[PDB]
Write an enzyme that holds these catalytic residues in place. Structure first.
Site, short mmCIF file in Angstrom:
data_model
loop_
_atom_site.label_atom_id
_atom_site.label_comp_id
_atom_site.label_asym_id
_atom_site.label_seq_id
_atom_site.Cartn_x
_atom_site.Cartn_y
_atom_site.Cartn_z
N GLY A 15 0.83 -1.19 0.00
CA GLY A 15 0.00 0.00 0.00
C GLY A 15 0.86 1.23 0.00
CE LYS A 16 -2.62 3.59 -3.56
NZ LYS A 16 -3.53 3.42 -2.39
N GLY A 17 0.77 5.84 0.80
CA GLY A 17 0.21 6.87 1.68
C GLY A 17 1.21 7.77 2.39
CG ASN A 18 0.37 9.35 5.35
OD1 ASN A 18 -0.78 9.82 5.33
ND2 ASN A 18 0.64 8.19 5.95
CG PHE A 19 4.48 13.19 1.78
CD1 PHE A 19 4.12 14.18 0.87
CD2 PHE A 19 4.05 13.32 3.10
CE1 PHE A 19 3.33 15.26 1.26
CE2 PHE A 19 3.25 14.39 3.49
CZ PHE A 19 2.91 15.37 2.57
N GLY A 20 5.00 8.45 1.24
CA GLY A 20 5.72 7.18 1.30
C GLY A 20 4.92 5.93 0.99
CE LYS A 41 5.61 5.51 6.34
NZ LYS A 41 4.53 5.96 7.26
CG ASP A 135 -3.88 8.75 9.82
OD1 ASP A 135 -4.89 9.30 9.33
OD2 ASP A 135 -3.10 8.04 9.15
C1 LIG Z 1 -4.33 -2.64 3.88
N1 LIG Z 1 -4.91 -3.60 3.18
N2 LIG Z 1 -3.24 -1.84 3.31
C2 LIG Z 1 -3.52 -0.99 2.15
C3 LIG Z 1 -3.00 0.48 2.33
F1 LIG Z 1 -3.61 1.10 3.34
F2 LIG Z 1 -2.92 1.22 1.21
O1 LIG Z 1 -1.61 0.44 2.76
C4 LIG Z 1 -1.14 -0.66 3.45
C5 LIG Z 1 0.22 -0.67 3.74
C6 LIG Z 1 0.74 -1.72 4.47
C7 LIG Z 1 -0.06 -2.73 4.98
C8 LIG Z 1 0.52 -3.82 5.81
N3 LIG Z 1 0.16 -5.05 5.43
C9 LIG Z 1 0.79 -6.07 6.03
N4 LIG Z 1 1.70 -6.03 7.01
C10 LIG Z 1 2.00 -4.78 7.38
N5 LIG Z 1 2.90 -4.42 8.34
C11 LIG Z 1 2.95 -3.06 8.43
C12 LIG Z 1 2.08 -2.49 7.55
C13 LIG Z 1 1.82 -1.02 7.38
C14 LIG Z 1 0.39 -0.53 7.51
O2 LIG Z 1 0.29 0.69 6.79
C15 LIG Z 1 -1.02 1.24 6.76
C16 LIG Z 1 1.46 -3.59 6.85
C17 LIG Z 1 -1.42 -2.70 4.69
C18 LIG Z 1 -1.96 -1.70 3.89
#
Ligand SMILES: *C(=N)N1CC(F)(F)Oc2ccc(-c3ncnc4[nH]cc(CCOC)c34)cc21
Length: 281
Positions: A15-20, A41, A135
């Site tokens: 996933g993507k979000g907030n400049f990263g 990240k 958030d």
């Molecule tokens: C959820 N399905 N997402 C989609 C999104 F919000 F765009 O971005 C995400 C980024 C990362 C994850 C994630 N998935 C699995 N293990 C993880 N460990 C840390 C993180 C970061 C969470 O960031 C929002 C994840 C899920 C989503």
């Protein structure tokens, strides 16, 4: 603690979000595709304060050790001493938002309340460490297993100085306004009390199983009608709130109503909320 970029074999985007962004990597030094999976990240494009904000996110999560907060595994460096990447544990079930939609026929109110209890307990801990999440939303919560959730995304998280129990931000909040408390909306004030408000929207989110049709955005915009932020403030200042999710237990809706008290000091604490949620199971 220190991950070598040469041994971090990238798989997909998480996933993507907030400049990263977050990437699904494999930490496999052997180069054979037989190593542990990690969530990594980076910032898709670096900046001035962006690099400092990311550095603070790393400090915050390094110092957080809770079963209800996503585990920090380490960092991966490039220049000296700029921590290029943040390495966290990989929770394959991903977001609670998407997990809810995908499994709603299986998850009953008992399980939804367990999640609530765990989200609350993790927020209790953050508050204890003087951390304002800023958030909290179901999109920012992860699933360890069927009965375990962890709070994630500390990209906007701030630390309260000991002299101040509130935090005023300057740059406008580029996150959906539907989770912010009125004081965040009007005066850019963020606190543990605003996190409690955002928790009520999380309880709403849980009990609607993150349906897009009655989502916080969808349902408030429908109720609205001037700038969008102003229309939301007017609504909430009149005392208008998100409707009770369909089939939602009344006790839970009442707890949402509580989290949504106009003044921050009238909203229950996470310490106060936790045993109330445990009573409902
Ligand atoms: C959820 N399905 N997402 C989609 C999104 F919000 F765009 O971005 C995400 C980024 C990362 C994850 C994630 N998935 C699995 N293990 C993880 N460990 C840390 C993180 C970061 C969470 O960031 C929002 C994840 C899920 C989503």
């Amino acid at each position: 603690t220190i991950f070598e970029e040469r041994h971090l074999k990238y798989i997909s985007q998480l996933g993507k979000g907030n400049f990263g962004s977050v990437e699904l990597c494999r930490y496999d030094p052997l180069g054979d595709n037989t190593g542990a999976l990690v969530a990594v990240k980076q910032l898709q494009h670096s900046g001035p304060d962006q690099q400092r904000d990311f550095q603070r996110e790393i400090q915050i999560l390094k110092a957080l050790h809770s079963d209800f907060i996503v585990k920090y595994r380490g960092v991966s460096y490039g220049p000296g001493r700029q921590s290029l990447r943040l390495v966290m544990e990989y929770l394959p079930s991903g977001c609670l938002r998407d997990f809810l939609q995908r499994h709603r026929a299986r998850l009953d109110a008992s399980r939804l309340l367990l999640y609530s209890s765990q989200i609350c307990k993790g927020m209790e801990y953050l508050g204890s460490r003087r951390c304002v999440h800023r958030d909290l939303a179901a999109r920012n919560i992860l699933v360890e297993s069927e009965a375990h959730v962890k709070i994630a995304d500390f990209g906007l998280a701030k630390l309260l100085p000991l002299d101040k129990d509130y935090y005023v931000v300057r740059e406008p909040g580029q996150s959906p306004i539907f989770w912010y408390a009125p004081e965040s909306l009007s005066d850019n004030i963020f606190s543990r009390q605003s996190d409690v408000w955002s928790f009520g929207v999380v309880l709403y989110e849980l009990f609607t199983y993150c349906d897009k049709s009655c989502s916080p955005s969808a349902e408030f915009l429908r109720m609205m009608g001037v700038p969008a932020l102003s229309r939301l403030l007017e609504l909430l200042e009149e005392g208008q709130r998100l409707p009770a999710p369909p089939a939602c237990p009344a006790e839970v809706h009442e707890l949402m109503k509580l989290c949504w008290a106009p003044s921050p000091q009238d909203r229950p604490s996470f310490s106060a909320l936790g045993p109330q949620l445990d009573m409902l199971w």
